[PDB]
Amino acid sequence: KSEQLLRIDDHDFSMRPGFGGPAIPVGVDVQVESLDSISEVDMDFTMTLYLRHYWKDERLSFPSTNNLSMTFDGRLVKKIWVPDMFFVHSKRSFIHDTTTDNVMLRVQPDGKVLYSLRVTVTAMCNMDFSRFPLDTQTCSLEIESYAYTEDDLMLYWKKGNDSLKTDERISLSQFLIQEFHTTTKLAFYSSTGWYNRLYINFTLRRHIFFFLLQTYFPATLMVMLSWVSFWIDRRAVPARVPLGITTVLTMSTIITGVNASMPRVSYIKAVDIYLWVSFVFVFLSVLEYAAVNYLTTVQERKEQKDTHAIDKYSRIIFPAAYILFNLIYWSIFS
Amino acid sequence: KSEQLLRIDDHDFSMRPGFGGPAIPVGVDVQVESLDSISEVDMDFTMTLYLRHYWKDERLSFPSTNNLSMTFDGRLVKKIWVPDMFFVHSKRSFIHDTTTDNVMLRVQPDGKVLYSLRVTVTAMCNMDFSRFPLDTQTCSLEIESYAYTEDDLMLYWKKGNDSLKTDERISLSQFLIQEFHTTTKLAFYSSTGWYNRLYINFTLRRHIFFFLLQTYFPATLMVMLSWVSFWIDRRAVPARVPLGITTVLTMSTIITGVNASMPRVSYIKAVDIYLWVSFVFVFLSVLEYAAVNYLTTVQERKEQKDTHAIDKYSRIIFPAAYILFNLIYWSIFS
Amino acid sequence: KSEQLLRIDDHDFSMRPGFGGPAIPVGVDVQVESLDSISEVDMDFTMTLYLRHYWKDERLSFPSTNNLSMTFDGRLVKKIWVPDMFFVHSKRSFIHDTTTDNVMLRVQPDGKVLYSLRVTVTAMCNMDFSRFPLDTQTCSLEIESYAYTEDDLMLYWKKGNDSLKTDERISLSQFLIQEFHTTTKLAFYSSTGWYNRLYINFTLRRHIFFFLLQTYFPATLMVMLSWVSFWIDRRAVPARVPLGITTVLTMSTIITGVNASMPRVSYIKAVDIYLWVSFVFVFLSVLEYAAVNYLTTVQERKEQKDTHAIDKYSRIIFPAAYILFNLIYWSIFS
Amino acid sequence: KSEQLLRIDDHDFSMRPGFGGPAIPVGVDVQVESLDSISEVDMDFTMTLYLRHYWKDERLSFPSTNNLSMTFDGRLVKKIWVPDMFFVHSKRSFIHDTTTDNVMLRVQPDGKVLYSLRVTVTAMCNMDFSRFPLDTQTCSLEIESYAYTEDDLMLYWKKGNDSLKTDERISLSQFLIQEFHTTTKLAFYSSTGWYNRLYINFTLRRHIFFFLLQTYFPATLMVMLSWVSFWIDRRAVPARVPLGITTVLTMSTIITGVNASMPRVSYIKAVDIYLWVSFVFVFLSVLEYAAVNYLTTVQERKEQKDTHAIDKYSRIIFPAAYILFNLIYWSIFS
Amino acid sequence: KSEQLLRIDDHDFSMRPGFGGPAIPVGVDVQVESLDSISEVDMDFTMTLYLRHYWKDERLSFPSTNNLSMTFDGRLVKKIWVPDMFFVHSKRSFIHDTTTDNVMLRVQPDGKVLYSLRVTVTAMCNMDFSRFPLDTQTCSLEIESYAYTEDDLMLYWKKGNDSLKTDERISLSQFLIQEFHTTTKLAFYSSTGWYNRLYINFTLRRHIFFFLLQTYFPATLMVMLSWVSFWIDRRAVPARVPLGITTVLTMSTIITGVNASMPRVSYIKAVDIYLWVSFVFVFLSVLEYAAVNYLTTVQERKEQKDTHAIDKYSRIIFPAAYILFNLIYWSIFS
Numbered sequence A, B, C, D, E: 001k002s003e004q005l006l007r008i009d010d011h012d013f014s015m016r017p018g019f020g021g022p023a024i025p026v027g028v029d030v031q032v033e034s035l036d037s038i039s040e041v042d043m044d045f046t047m048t049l050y051l052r053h054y055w056k057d058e059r060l061s062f063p064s065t066n067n068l069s070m071t072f073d074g075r076l077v078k079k080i081w082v083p084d085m086f087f088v089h090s091k092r093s094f095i096h097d098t099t100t101d102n103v104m105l106r107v108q109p110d111g112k113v114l115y116s117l118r119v120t121v122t123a124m125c126n127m128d129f130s131r132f133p134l135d136t137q138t139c140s141l142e143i144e145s146y147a148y149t150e151d152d153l154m155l156y157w158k159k160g161n162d163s164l165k166t167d168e169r170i171s172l173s174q175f176l177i178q179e180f181h182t183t184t185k186l187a188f189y190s191s192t193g194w195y196n197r198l199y200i201n202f203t204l205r206r207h208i209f210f211f212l213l214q215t216y217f218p219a220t221l222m223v224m225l226s227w228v229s230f231w232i233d234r235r236a237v238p239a240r241v242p243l244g245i246t247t248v249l250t251m252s253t254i255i256t257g258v259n260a261s262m263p264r265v266s267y268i269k270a271v272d273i274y275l276w277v278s279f280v281f282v283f284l285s286v287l288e289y290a291a292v293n294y295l296t297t298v299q300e301r302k303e304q305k306d307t308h309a310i311d312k313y314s315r316i317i318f319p320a321a322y323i324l325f326n327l328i329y330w331s332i333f334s
């Protein structure tokens, strides 16, 4: 029996190695396999990865006439001491178990141990949509010991920044992913003390040009279309009136359709400001002709008892104001 | 073996400490990690937190030449007595178990015990949408002992209002969160007796200005647009008629689009009252011109065999009535 | 050890109390905590409740110098006999287990037993939507023994109609709930025999006035709007034609929007009949003017080589027919 | 102890009854409780049922002074041999376990056994939507032994066609259900051999008249509406043009709305053919007037330097072609 | 007892067969039962299959007077050594367990073993939608040993390309499936070494003709409809203007409706390019008439103080440009 080469019943494996003395160092490496999904309304993401641990325990040393190591599956985990890592700020997680538990232990003759398992985790990520669609988001995954303070267990990245590897074809459908790196920081709990925490950081971006074509283009086109009435004969009322009202209807169907396709986030974003300002422009172009038609009728009635000046000024004033608004908007939102 | 320092087989751990006598006090602290989601149709919310217990048991005392405590994981829980807390009015819950069970026990030399675990819970919350979007909601989470009355177990907040801590970046996508505090109250069951219950309370609010721009603005604009026809020559029938009917169509597409984007709650809310009143105003503006055109045709036919008075009065009467409705509405709904 | 006061190893707890003789009576009480959700497409509902059992077993009697009872958690259930209740016509269910199993047993000195647990269940409910939105639905939850016929186990409500209690704030978002009561009935299985079954019954209703404002109001308004053309000068073709076609478009957008918001039930309901009849009325008003314009052109051409009679009759005939349809419809559907 | 009446430790219950000799016959009965849901996109359905087995084992015989049988719950299943049935072509399944495992065993004095359990299963069903909404679908559920060939275990329906019972109120929301019956057939696996398989078959149909009113009615009405322009004075251009373009818009909103409400199946179905043909008819009616107006203008200009023949022919030709298309369509698709 | 024919307690089944020496070969066969679902947004698919293993172990040999083998269920798996296969790049998986665990073991007298189980797996698949709806996708499922390198375990397809079988009625609702085959490749891990990996490959395609009718047809029809105004009398302003604006509205409702029905993938696809170009064409046709009407009014006013040339050129220039765009587009995207 291989479990008799390790004197399992001769030691108390409910206490850590080096109990009573300096803290035992534990090194960690991570390999990220994929990014599975992201939820903008609930503000979280899901990832699948491999987690590896490295430490030394003299109680597991065994004699050997060679330098070969012994390998075990997850059934041995319940008989020895192992570190208790958990994921901070997570919502759910599980360990894969097909066709059996995805766990491995390798023991060197001198007592060095490698501990490897495959896991899937869902973690929270606070997001800010004020600058949508030109927003940038930063996310992280955090690892910590549940019950051991820094006086008993010292947790660190085994090879610094070389301890993190990512798959060559990692991707998300609606985002671009960049800038993976690691950091560390100490955390304080009033109930028990100080703990060391490890982080994995990355950044997300959208495809701007899609949103530009999809949203900003049609609104600008309809605003330019509403200016055509300034060049039409003012005597053609049955042509001037339906044009304006139909332009208003069209802008409304555009805005409704654009709403239906964005994530349901109930506060003001940049693209709403652009859309609503454009709608106000279309509205004012209808009031302009109402004033022209009333003044012309008044003059004709007075007389019985050429281009109007308002059209001449509007032809210049409307585009300049729209250009100025665009300059200010794009200087503010980049 | 550390489990031999506690005389586990020398006591009956199916009975509480102090059995036969006064009730044993149990103190509680809570740390809230995040708010995960909220469902308006099903009327519930989900939260993740840390739950800590504190009590004393002389049967767990052990000799020591120092003042160091002993720490255990969840495997010891099945060998000793622990309190049986459950969440009242909950729909589902679970205890996190990656990479192992997220449970800890710490025992002092004199028998003081700390019991800590990490849990996620979904709880009901009755909501009232009568004043939407200007509504305010209050929610709570409740903690109680399943099997012990106040004569056997006395449950209380360990440090009063200082027993509740919340994470600095707690947030929801569509709500603002304020005013966390704790309370206590006694509850009666006819089957078994009196129990003490603990509460955690908080309040939610919406972003009003978003809904104002999104809903109230376009309806007011279309109502003002329908008044333009009062200043148009009454002889231009092919201009007057299509304007009114197209305004009605536009208001209808607005209302349908607004419905499609609100939570599916099938009873009357304030924003429906505003929308429907606006639609009635647009409808009456079309009936006005129908009457004008009939009367003018009658006069002309009679004669063969200037502004009409109705337009002159409507130009004044319609805006005043709308302003009065707005005053009453906003005095009622704040 | 408290489990030595009951002679657990001196009896066979795989057989019922009173084996060999008359059936053992078992009384039941129920406390309903909440109604969690309802699904109209799948035709089911979900509820959370407390279930309590009461029976006597002389094998559990123990000596005592007082009249105090002993209390146990779920770990004792596997050592003694307990009744095997299940829910008939259910789709899924589970027993709550945070922070431990929500089960309790209380044993009197003379052998009386109380057995209490907390459970959540999803059950089927056949619904009929023919009269929507004026429909009424009735639902039930059923309880039965899996393996014991009425010759071995007699199941009954412990206190008649007083055995059912409901929470003071039970509610659903889209329904009104009334008329809770209990009944009993015997059921026959050809495989094994007769069993007694218990029922919990209640009734659901909708908020009619919401649906009236939301659906019936706009359709009636558009039907009345289509009658305006009967009072317009027949010589104004470019006013008469676009009015009718735009009214048809508006009614179509209303019907599409109303469909998008009802539960996806693919058979004919009352509100469809009202909507479709209204659409036919709008369609006939356009055919009326087509006939008028053709006849007028024919007369003018014939002559070269006042109000038309059709308008005069339509002005009377259309509203009377619509009023008659409304009388018949509302006498049929209440 | 009742488990000592059966000599459990005197036999090897890892081998079947009659090992070494002819195959042991096993009879099956099924009672269907409900049909829970159906998914058209994923092509599967879900059902809840009772499954009963019947066989004889002389090793379970026990002495008795009467003819009474002994009943056990699921805990005895792990101590004796039982048949290993599984569901072929299923996606998920589970056995109900509230308030305990829904399993029963009944043993006669002579060794006859009844084995009963309650289960829910989701199974695949390939569907063909070519004839939608006039399609018909056939589904089945299949039962088979996992590890025993027909040489060791003989599986059959216990009472032929009388072995299948269905609940009196079984129903689905969007389908009609008819024609339950059973069959059997032998299956071959190259890895191990021949196995006998049992089937349960049934058929589904839709409510045609709903779809007729919902889809075919409005399209026919708009096609008939487009024919009105053939009777309108050709000199009234501002009446003829907007009518046609608005009819095209209305047909487009109808088709979009109809798409939004059908299951997302991305290939051509019959109702698409009808809709698209109707749209082509509306399109050609606009080209007709374009040609009329150009020819009239040419004639007038030529002259300066009554009904047109095209209208007269169109008034006859358009309805006849539409009627012929309808005859062919409904002779093809029934 | 059959488990005494195999000397289970006389061997250490924590080490592989042939420990210390050359690697043990393990052959694999796969039978695919169904394809359950596919998710385009999350980029994964789900499949149900049978997995079979074949190897030899002299420790399991037993005496026999015949050539009959012994069969066991999953309970024996925990007592002997078996291979530890897992699925690479998977998101979740499970082993079916109704009515018991779907596992089988068959042992020959000479120690040959067959190991069979039924499993369902969800696996990732990166997709590219640039050419939608004319895109083609390739997917794979991968199998690998968790803990044994190629020096200890040699994994291979048992019968080459004949080791893969697929069900005769495998299908997906929205895709066509072709070209199943197998491959193998060696993989390197810096943590432990080289491993052999097996692949199952297949290809997916869409139904093009559906998308052609659904999207490309209406846009082309509306572009052709906008050309009608070039043949209309330029003096009929109240006919020319509403036609153009209504055509713009119709194209907008078409594009919105087409968006609502495609998978929510936020980057530019081919069908967007076609739609947006068509919209620009419709927009330019309105600017054309605006210029014509202004120039005509200028000429008339100048004079007071036939076909216009622009119409004559547009009648030729617009269709040629559209045909050229179509030629380039369909030469690029096939």
Ligand SMILES: Cl/C(=C\n1cncn1)c1ccc(Cl)cc1Cl
Pocket (backbone or CB within 6 Å): A251, A252, A253, A255, A256, A257, A259, A260, A275, A276, A279, A280, B213, B214, B215, B217, B218, B257, B258, B261
């Ligand atoms: Cl965006 C919208 C209407 N909604 C459509 N879906 C939900 N709300 C709107 C908001 C502001 C303005 Cl100025 C115009 C419009 Cl049309």
Ligand SMILES: Cl/C(=C\n1cncn1)c1ccc(Cl)cc1Cl
Pocket (backbone or CB within 6 Å): B251, B252, B255, B256, B257, B259, B260, B275, B276, B279, B280, C213, C214, C215, C217, C218, C257, C258, C261
């Ligand atoms: Cl809100 C709606 C129609 N619906 C749109 N989606 C669902 N119902 C409506 C209700 C009342 C009035 Cl006066 C006008 C309208 Cl347009």
Ligand SMILES: Cl/C(=C\n1cncn1)c1ccc(Cl)cc1Cl
Pocket (backbone or CB within 6 Å): C251, C252, C255, C256, C259, C260, C275, C276, C277, C279, C280, D213, D214, D215, D217, D218, D257, D258, D261
């Ligand atoms: Cl209700 C509908 C169209 N649909 C909208 N969504 C789904 N179908 C309709 C049915 C009958 C009649 Cl007469 C008119 C109409 Cl517009």
Ligand SMILES: Cl/C(=C\n1cncn1)c1ccc(Cl)cc1Cl
Pocket (backbone or CB within 6 Å): D251, D252, D255, D256, D257, D259, D260, D275, D276, D279, D280, E213, E214, E215, E217, E218, E257, E258, E261
């Ligand atoms: Cl059915 C559709 C547009 N879509 C709406 N939703 C998705 N596609 C269509 C197809 C063919 C024809 Cl000839 C006309 C139309 Cl409007």
Ligand SMILES: Cl/C(=C\n1cncn1)c1ccc(Cl)cc1Cl
Pocket (backbone or CB within 6 Å): A213, A214, A215, A217, A218, A257, A258, A261, E251, E252, E255, E256, E257, E259, E260, E275, E276, E279, E280
């Ligand atoms: Cl596709 C769309 C609007 N959207 C509808 N749903 C979501 N966005 C659009 C994009 C570009 C152009 Cl040139 C015209 C239009 Cl109408």
Ligand SMILES: CCCCCCCC
Pocket (backbone or CB within 6 Å): A268, A273, A276, A277, A280
């Ligand atoms: C905080 C931004 C407000 C923008 C208002 C736009 C009004 C058209």
Ligand SMILES: CCCCCCCC
Pocket (backbone or CB within 6 Å): A220, A322, A323, A326, A327, A330
């Ligand atoms: C009409 C669009 C104007 C865009 C100007 C952009 C200035 C950065």
Ligand SMILES: CCCCCCCC
Pocket (backbone or CB within 6 Å): A208, A330, A334
């Ligand atoms: C980061 C993209 C900015 C786009 C500017 C557009 C100005 C019209």
Ligand SMILES: CCCCCCCC
Pocket (backbone or CB within 6 Å): B268, B273, B276, B277, B280
């Ligand atoms: C209880 C509020 C009713 C509001 C009716 C509005 C009618 C336009």
Ligand SMILES: CCCCCCCC
Pocket (backbone or CB within 6 Å): B220, B322, B323, B326, B327, B330
């Ligand atoms: C036309 C909008 C009027 C708003 C008045 C507000 C009174 C509080």
Ligand SMILES: CCCCCCCC
Pocket (backbone or CB within 6 Å): B208, B330, B334
């Ligand atoms: C709490 C916001 C009230 C808004 C009043 C608006 C009156 C037009």
Ligand SMILES: CCCCCCCC
Pocket (backbone or CB within 6 Å): C268, C273, C276, C277, C280
């Ligand atoms: C069974 C009700 C049929 C109603 C048809 C309505 C036609 C407009």
Ligand SMILES: CCCCCCCC
Pocket (backbone or CB within 6 Å): C220, C322, C323, C326, C327, C330
């Ligand atoms: C035009 C609506 C008529 C409603 C009449 C109601 C008769 C009960």
Ligand SMILES: CCCCCCCC
Pocket (backbone or CB within 6 Å): C208, C330, C334
């Ligand atoms: C139960 C409500 C009946 C409503 C009748 C309305 C008649 C116009």
Ligand SMILES: CCCCCCCC
Pocket (backbone or CB within 6 Å): D268, D273, D276, D277, D280
């Ligand atoms: C295979 C059916 C094609 C139908 C094309 C319809 C074109 C209007």
Ligand SMILES: CCCCCCCC
Pocket (backbone or CB within 6 Å): D220, D322, D323, D326, D327, D330
């Ligand atoms: C205009 C509809 C014609 C329907 C004819 C039906 C022939 C079976």
